[PDB]
Amino acid sequence: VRKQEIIKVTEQLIEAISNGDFESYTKMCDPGMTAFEPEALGNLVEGLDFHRFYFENLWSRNSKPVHTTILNPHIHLMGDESACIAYIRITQYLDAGGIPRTAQSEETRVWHRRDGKWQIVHFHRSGAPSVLPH
Amino acid sequence: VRKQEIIKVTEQLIEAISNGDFESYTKMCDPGMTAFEPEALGNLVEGLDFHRFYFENLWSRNSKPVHTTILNPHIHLMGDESACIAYIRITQYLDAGGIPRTAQSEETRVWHRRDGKWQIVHFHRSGAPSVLPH
Amino acid sequence: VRKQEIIKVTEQLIEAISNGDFESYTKMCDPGMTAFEPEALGNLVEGLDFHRFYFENLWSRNSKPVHTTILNPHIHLMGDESACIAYIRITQYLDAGGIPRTAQSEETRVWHRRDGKWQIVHFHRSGAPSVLPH
Amino acid sequence: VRKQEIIKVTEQLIEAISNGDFESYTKMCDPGMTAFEPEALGNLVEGLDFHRFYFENLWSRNSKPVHTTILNPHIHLMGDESACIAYIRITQYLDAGGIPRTAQSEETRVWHRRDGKWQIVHFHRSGAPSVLPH
Amino acid sequence: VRKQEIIKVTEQLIEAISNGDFESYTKMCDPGMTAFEPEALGNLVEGLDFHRFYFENLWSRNSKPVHTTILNPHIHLMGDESACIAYIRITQYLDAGGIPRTAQSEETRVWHRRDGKWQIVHFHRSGAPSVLPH
Amino acid sequence: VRKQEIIKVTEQLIEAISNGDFESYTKMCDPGMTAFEPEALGNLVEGLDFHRFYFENLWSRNSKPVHTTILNPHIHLMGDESACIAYIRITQYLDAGGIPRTAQSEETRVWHRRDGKWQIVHFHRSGAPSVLPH
Amino acid sequence: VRKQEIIKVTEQLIEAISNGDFESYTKMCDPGMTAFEPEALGNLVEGLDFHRFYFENLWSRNSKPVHTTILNPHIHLMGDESACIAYIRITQYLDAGGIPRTAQSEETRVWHRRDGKWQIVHFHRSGAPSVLPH
Amino acid sequence: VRKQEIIKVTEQLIEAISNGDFESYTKMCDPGMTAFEPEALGNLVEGLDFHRFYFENLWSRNSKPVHTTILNPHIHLMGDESACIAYIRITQYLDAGGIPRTAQSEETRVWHRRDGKWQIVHFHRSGAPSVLPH
Amino acid sequence: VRKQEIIKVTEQLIEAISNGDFESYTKMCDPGMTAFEPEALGNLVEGLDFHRFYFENLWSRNSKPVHTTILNPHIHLMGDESACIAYIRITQYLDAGGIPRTAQSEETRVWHRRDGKWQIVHFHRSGAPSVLPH
Amino acid sequence: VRKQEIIKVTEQLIEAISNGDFESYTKMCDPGMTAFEPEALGNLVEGLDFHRFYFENLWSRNSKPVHTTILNPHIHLMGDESACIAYIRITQYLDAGGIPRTAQSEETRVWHRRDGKWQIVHFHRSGAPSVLPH
Amino acid sequence: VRKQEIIKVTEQLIEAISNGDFESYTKMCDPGMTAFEPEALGNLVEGLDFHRFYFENLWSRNSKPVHTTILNPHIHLMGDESACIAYIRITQYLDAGGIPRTAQSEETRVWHRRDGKWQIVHFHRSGAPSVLPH
Amino acid sequence: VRKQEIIKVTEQLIEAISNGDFESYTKMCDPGMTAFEPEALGNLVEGLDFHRFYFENLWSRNSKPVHTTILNPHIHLMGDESACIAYIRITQYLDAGGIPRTAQSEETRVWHRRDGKWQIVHFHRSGAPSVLPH
Amino acid sequence: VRKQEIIKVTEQLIEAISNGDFESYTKMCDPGMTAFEPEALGNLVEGLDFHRFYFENLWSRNSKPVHTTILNPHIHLMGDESACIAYIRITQYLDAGGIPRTAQSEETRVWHRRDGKWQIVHFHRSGAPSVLPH
Amino acid sequence: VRKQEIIKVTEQLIEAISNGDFESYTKMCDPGMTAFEPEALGNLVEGLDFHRFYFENLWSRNSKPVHTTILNPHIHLMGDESACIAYIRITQYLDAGGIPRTAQSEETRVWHRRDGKWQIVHFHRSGAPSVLPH
């Protein structure tokens, strides 16, 4: 039972990023959230304003065909408040010539249930950048 | 107070890996532990036998000078059972010519307190491989 | 006799992919079907939605001249329910300049007769990508 | 229950190849077995004499440290006689300088139970060659 | 005397290919004819449908200036039914800029007299592709 | 029946070349035999003295492990006197470091039965040189 | 308390440069200010006229989207008159194709409180040039 | 007068580093000292243990000929407690072949007079690494 | 005296080729004439139809400025019927941009006086192709 | 009949060069003989002293295995005194590692019968240098 | 006092070159003036006509934004008639895309006071050419 | 005195070439004049028709700005009839983009006074081609 | 007369550097002497201690054959106290293999007669480094 | 008659250089002789001391096999005192591996008969350096 709720909230977050829905994304993140990812050049960023730039300059503007597969999700439940999920992410997208391409990333998300709502406190991404290559 | 215990157990684990102490490392890991790192080629590994190969073929054999700095540790406490730590790791080492070199990695470790003992349930590494370049 | 039916259903499937007929392709695949191929970046995919992207963005749209040769089909029959076919596939196609090109792949398909109908349960491709190079 | 027997016989075969035990390997293969793999240059080979060359010139001679991980095995059972297994294979080995390296392959094996004994009738490999790179 | 008839029928076939006359080419080939050539990627093709693609997409459409020289034809007569011819082929053609170019191939053709008519049963080409380079 | 004799005499010839047995090779060739192959630089050679150089400087001297596979032999019988065989040839050999390698060639041989004995009148090779690469 | 005023005046200066406000920048700099940065080719520049060129030819003209993050500011207070700040600077900007990019620099600023107003007496920059790459 | 004391203590520190005198270097640094330099990979380091590695593995061991020139020192005095110095540094050294080479760096040092003794609170280096290139 | 007639007829032939006068060129060549030159790819051509292609596709069409110098002609007279001439040829021409270029070739021509008229029986060219480079 | 004498004297000359027999070579050349070949850098040489250097520094010293094939000799007879021969030359030789190699050249020789003896008055070579590549 | 007059006349000359004022430049140069600079290809030029070409083809025509900094001028006074000045020159300019660039040169000027007027008798430039790179 | 006349006639000749005045150039050259220069590909040319091509296709057509400097002329007088001059030549010219460029050549001219008029009998050029590079 | 004394003292200085005679070099330099040269990386050095390193590590140790030519010395005399000399310098030397090499530099030296003795106050070098290349 | 004496004295000089006979070379040169050649880097040298370095470090020491051909000497006689010779020079030599090589240069020599003896007043060389390449 309880592992399916961590998959559900993770798929909802990946959908909100894909739509460019920064309002829904802001409800799902902790305000003190930290991140490691390729765009931050090896630094640990904190809060949502680093991410807001990609929403305002890509995700809110973009309307191209994109598809995401979550492969082999492994979930750790750590009492009733706390969870971790690790998965491989495959992205299919059309390039600047309109040709299909595939990208892979490795992703970790750490979730805490605050006031009865699940929120991300940390995430780590490796492999392909979130800004897709052309 | 409680954030210092997560720093302590993380430094003890980094020391056990550096010494090649697979017995102490086995006490600090959960048997169901998962990992993402450069040596696994983008796959999620599970359990300790993938790591045992680097202990038996490098860390247990090695006696060269190496130094580690943990930069900017950020810690999330998620109730009394559960914690996450994220940091930048700098490694100083001598190359095959005896010349000093520096490497950087980005690291996340997820800790759960099981039967009163802290253990790693998941980790994620990016940047430099653990097998240092020459 | 029975080896010719495995050749027949394999040629019908290659024709449905070539036409972009995702409805006919969906009748010939098991819903739990797995695949290895160049577009999946070394991962094992499951179900039909990874493939649906190439139907919707290429095969359903495409009208260029293409020809396929099946070379040296070897067939194993494993009782009355189960079969395997292995072959070399040659594809002739026109490039973006309108010049003829040739590509080669190596293909395995595993068939099970469910409710009296043959369906693919697994496939593996090597060599040329299915998205043809220009 | 029955999926564990396909994992067992697959691990026993990978062990016999790793030991250079061509006698045990010959008991586990069908005499009419076919294969696709990187060493055959894109051709379909048949019978055991192509493989005998790597046993006699490497596997029977070799004594270096090597470790294998089978990741995410997916199994199809197709009546009581017939089975297919698909997995990712990770190999850890020491290079010519004595440094640890990792390789990945994608593997399919098709099994038939003949006279009460499981035997391979076909296999397909992609990614890293079986002769490990240095 | 009899060697001149093998030269005659060989020059008539090279003319029919050059004109894009697939009807005349089909009269001169055996329906079971095999071939080795650069376009088949190192495979042995059988029958006429692999060749039909180059007639329909180039030879039937093309009207550029092209000239062919047969150099040093050597002929073996093997009773009254059977003959082999081996020669060097030089092709002069205009490139995409309208500049003259030269290409060389090495060619073997095996002829059998069936029902009083000479037909090709096998051919082998090396050197320049039949689709001329630009 | 009669196709097996063309396979037999072809395997005996490949064995005589592999042993460096120029006496047995001279019995199997016509004295007027012609050839196309990579070592002749695109020229048609005639008689046995071009080949004698590789017997005297390699095949008669060599004792390294080598294995040959004949893949997919296609045979044309052209009355009772005359035959043609076409096949793919795979060669496994050890390099100068003692590492296994694989090479591929495409081969045609034309046979005539003179005084009741089969002899080669022409041959054509493509792909890998007969002098194996290191 | 007092470290927050050094962060405030540093963020105000970074804002004035980003706006192209050379009048506000001139109020915040000492007239005898020195600098090390990538644009000065390894030389120590003095006064404001070297910087005036980038205001007049870029910052006063530019209206593209740009965002700045100050990471890990460390501050030394050296009596009541004098302060030093060191930080990592991340810049997000759109390239000439309109694609998001990230740059990193390392920055030191030395502040003196003259007539009750904080002013920069020296600065040093490393990493990315201030003129952003495209 | 007072600018000459900042030159004096800066030359004494450069001499202590050149000798490998970590005891004298430890007297001249603040225990909370921060640094930016090429060996730290773009990170801000704090305290003396990162630097101790180059003393123990190079400067304490080294006895080769080296010469240093300080070019164009500019000094800011900021009350009686606090000073900043900026200069270009030229290093002459013999390479691994015994040939003279030259390197350049740009350096800033921030000094505070604590308990009547001048100590470094921050430093920033650019250009050549401190570990000299060969 | 007699050496000047071999120079005369050689200059007349070079003029006829330069004009694209295939009728005059056909009067000066023997019908059985052989040639070695760069366009024939290392083969010996015979008769005039290989050369006719360059007359019909370049020399008859071309009207650009071209100049030829014959340097150091050496002549052998071999009785009253037979002569050989060897010379260096310099060609000045305008490229596709209208810029002057120079090319060099080495040329041999063998002349026989048949029915009182001098005709070329063989020629050999080296260096620059006759189709000038751009 | 008479064409066989031009082949004979040409094979005798190629043998004398291969042996390093400069005395026999001097009997077969005219003292006024001219040559074009790769070693003369595009110049026309005259007399025997340019060639004497390769006899004295290679051909007289050399004892390695070498074999020569004359392919497709074409001969022009020009009265009773004068002849020309043109052929392709294939050379088989062992390299510095002892591995067989092949080279090709194109050759013309002009012969005059002086005092009843055939002598070379001119020669022209193209393709491979006479000093064989390693 | 007297060093400021050498700075003044040097800045006036750099201004006259920047304006393309060849009349003012001619008043400031000796008619026998010599120069070393990158445009003269390592030669010593004499008089003003080599320089006149850059005035007439660039400096008199140019109207782009350019800025010059003189860094660290060192002056030698050698009696009342004679002076030398040495400095580093930084040039800021816009490229062909309108992007700011920086160049560095090293400059020496030798001045003599003739009839009460300072004039250049020699100059030497190194580093960046005077014709700025794009 | 007499050395100035050799400079005068040399400058007049360089002017006539620069103007494209082939009539004046023809008065200043001996009809038997020889030359070495980069355009002749290492050959010695004789007479004026090789040079006429550059007059007719460049110098007579050209109107771009060009300037020539003669550096360090050394003159040998060899009785009253004969002189030699050697100098370095610098050419300033505008490229195809309108940017100033510089070229260098080394030049020798040999003069003979025939019927009271100085004429060139030989010249030699090295370095830059006379056809200026773009 | 007076120009020969500037040549004399310049040749004596070049000799003292070539011998490694730092005592004689110190007598000929002003203690406040400045320099521009390739070894100083584009900086202006002052005094003799930068140069002392090349005396102590090369010139005092070296005994290889070296020869220097001064080409085209131009001298300006600026009253009775002051002189400037400009020349091209050619250096011939043996490389690490013992092969002759040539290098070129452009040099300026400024001389002042202090207390009746000529001394260098400034020098500038371009082209080849003083540390000769191998 | 008189042209043969210029060939004689030119061959004697080439022999004296080849022997390393600097005494004989000094008798044949004018003391004021000038030269252009590849070793002088595009400068005009004067007198014999530049050349003395190659005699003392190569020609006097060397004993390897070398051969020289003078091709196509053209001679101008300019009264009874003065002559010019121009020729192509071919050099055959053994490389560092003992393999024959060929080099080409273009050479001009200007001769004056002083006190009844011919002496070189100027020479110019192009193409291959005199120090032969390996």
Numbering used by the authors:
A (entry chain A), B (entry chain N), C (entry chain C), D (entry chain M), E (entry chain D), F (entry chain L), ...: 345 to 478
Question: What did the authors write?
Answer:
The AD hub, which evolved from bacterial dimeric enzymes, extends the β sheet to form lateral contact interfaces (LCs) needed for ring assembly, while the ancient dimer contact was preserved as the vertical contact interface (VC) in the mirror-symmetric two-stack hub. Linkers with variable length and sequence between isoforms and developmental splice variants, connect each AD with a peripheral kinase domain (KD). Here, we present near-atomic resolution cryogenic electron microscopy (cryo-EM) structures revealing that hubs from the α and β isoforms, either standalone or within an β holoenzyme, coexist as 12 and 14 subunit assemblies.
We expressed and purified a recombinant form of CaMKII comprising the α AD fused to a fluorescent Venus tag, separated by a flexible 15-amino-acid linker. From a single sample, we obtained two cryo-EM structures for the CaMKIIα hub, a dodecamer (12-mer) and a tetradecamer (14-mer), with 6 and 7 ADs in each of the two stacked rings, respectively. The 14-mer hub has a 12 Å increase in diameter and a larger central pore compared to the 12-mer hub in negative-stain single particle 2D-class averages of holoenzyme hubs. The sequences from the structures were aligned, and the residues conserved across the mammalian isoforms were mapped onto our 14-mer cryo-EM α hub to show the dielectric variations in the contact interfaces. The root mean square fluctuation (RMSF) values showed that the VC is more rigid than the LC in the tetramer extracted from the α 14-mer (α14T), consistent with the ePISA estimates of the energetics. The superimposed structures of the 12-mers between α-isoform and β-isoform had a root mean square deviation (RMSD) of 0.35 Å, while that for the comparison of the 14-mers between the two isoforms is 0.3 Å.
